[PDB]
Design a protein around this ligand. Structure first.
Ligand SMILES: CNC(=O)[C@H](Cc1ccccc1)NC(=O)[C@H](CC(C)C)[C@H](CSc1cccs1)C(=O)NO
Ligand SMILES: [Zn+2]
Ligand SMILES: [Zn+2]
Length: 447
């Protein structure tokens, strides 16, 4: 309960913000062009929050947060006073109406710029792309890549952190090989290696592209030391205190923490003989894991948070700039994201990216919950990414979207007159049908 509520709240706030910024771009550019905005609907369905401005503009918050619109003044929808005729949308030039229509996606892009600028002003952390472990017989193992190597670039594009590395790796789906400029950590002697991607197969929704290459990044190391023990837990009833060191679990010494994790998760109820050390004194204990609700089966909990040692700050990057520099870098980052979304849609259409791994609203909500839990410096880039996505999928040439408006408007500009009398209407309805079908298919592949 306490988790799903946070997820839904973060999802609703993210939606609200993005809808508001798109419709605000629409409304601002429209009002500046000289037309009169009537309704500023943020959401679909029955309205809940209606307010009226002095200029007659009605701001409306509805209940279905999966969209929104801006109702313009048009002679093709209501009878207009002879003086308000030039305040109508249809009585404007093709260029003005095209700008008013394109304002929305441009508003989303500008919101992404602003989010990344605010993040750069406040600063976003990051880890250097340094390999810690290499899985044998993998993509990177066969390319003469040794542990302790700092990735410098992917196909020439700079990769200062693991995030940019994954961002460039996902852009190589469908390719048979890729080129990575690497260097040992410390020495700036660059070297171009080539990863073979012919038999490469991974789901971007389920698999980390770094691990898909058999690469583990160097991160904070978990050590078999108890940081704190929650009260009224299995470890608390087992006699474990803060600062204890798990040495032996069921006869064999404890080498990794994932071993203890799997032993607690796959063995609920059954005892575990723990030989530990407390203040240099060896002790024996019997840990009986509980059985809290899990996914797929019954998982076991003990209430132990291990002690993690963060990797040295040598593998840390601070990405904060000054105001003007932050503006420049945010523009560059959002342009990169736009080009990457273009290439990703191209990959999905060309036939090498399955549509079943698409971002579904429940997955979007879980990601929003996780990000909002992580803080603001993570929630803002998430909002910027989803804003770029929304702005770029609405500029898609389809009758009901802003892009279809721009398309029919350009055809009117060339032809000298609106495309269709009612020949459009049968596409106006079919586009809404296709949008509802796409929404349903996206919701179903998420489930
Ligand atoms: C989550 N909904 C969307 O992303 C749809 C397009 C879509 C539908 C289904 C699947 C994928 C994309 N876009 C919009 O709702 C735009 C609103 C922005 C702020 C998101 C909106 C589209 S117009 C209208 C459609 C129905 C009544 S009014 C717009 O352009 N206002 O200026
Ligand atoms: Zn006037
Ligand atoms: Zn729009």
């Amino acid at each position: 309960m306490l988790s799903f509520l946070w997820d839904l709240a973060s999802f609703i706030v993210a939606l609200g913000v993005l809808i508001t910024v798109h419709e605000f771009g629409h409304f601002w550019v429209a009002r500046r062009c000289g037309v009169r905005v009537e309704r500023f609907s943020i959401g679909f369905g029955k309205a809940l929050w209606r307010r009226t401005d002095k200029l007659g503009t009605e701001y409306v918050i509805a209940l279905i947060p999966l969209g929104g619109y801006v109702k313009m003044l048009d002679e093709r929808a209501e009878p207009v006073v002879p003086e308000l005729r030039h305040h109508a949308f249809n009585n404007k030039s093709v260029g003005q109406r095209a700008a008013i229509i394109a304002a929305g996606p441009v508003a989303n892009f500008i919101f992404a710029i602003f989010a990344y600028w605010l993040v750069f002003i406040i600063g976003v952390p990051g880890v250097r792309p340094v390999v810690g472990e290499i899985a044998a017989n993998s993509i990177a193992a066969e390319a003469q890549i040794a542990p302790g190597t700092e990735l410098k670039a992917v196909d020439g594009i700079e990769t200062p952190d693991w995030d940019a590395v994954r961002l460039q790796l996902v852009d190589k789906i469908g390719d048979e090989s890729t080129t990575i400029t690497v260097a040992p950590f410390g020495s700036d002697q660059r070297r171009d290696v080539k990863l073979d991607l012919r038999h490469w197969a991974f789901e971007p929704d389920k698999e980390d592209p770094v691990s898909s290459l058999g690469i583990r990044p160097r991160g904070p190391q978990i050590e078999p030391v108890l940081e704190n023990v929650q009260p009224n837990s299995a470890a608390s009833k087992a006699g474990l205190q803060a600062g204890d060191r798990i040495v032996k679990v069921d006869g064999q010494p404890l080498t990794q923490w994932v071993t203890f994790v799997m032993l607690v998760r796959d063995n609920p109820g059954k005892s575990l003989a723990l030989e530990i050390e407390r203040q240099g004194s060896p002790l024996s204990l019997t840990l009986i894991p509980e059985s809290k609700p899990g996914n797929g089966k019954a998982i076991g909990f003990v209430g132990i948070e291990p002690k993690v040692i963060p990797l040295p700050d040598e593998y840390k990057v601070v990405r904060q700039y000054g105001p003007f520099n932050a503006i420049v870098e945010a523009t560059d980052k959002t342009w990169q994201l736009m080009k990457l979304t273009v290439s990703m849609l191209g990959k999905l259409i060309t036939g090498d990216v399955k549509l079943n791994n698409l971002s579904g609203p429940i997955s979007i909500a879980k990601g929003a919950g996780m990000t909002a839990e992580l803080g603001v410096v993570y929630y803002l880039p998430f909002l910027a990414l989803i804003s770029v996505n929304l702005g770029i999928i609405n500029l898609f040439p389809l009758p009901v979207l802003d892009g279809g408006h721009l398309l029919f408007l350009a055809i009117e500009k060339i032809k000298g007159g609106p495309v269709s009398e009612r020949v459009q209407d049968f596409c106006y309805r079919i586009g809404s049908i296709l949008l509802v079908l796409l929404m349903g298919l996206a919701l179903f592949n998420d489930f």
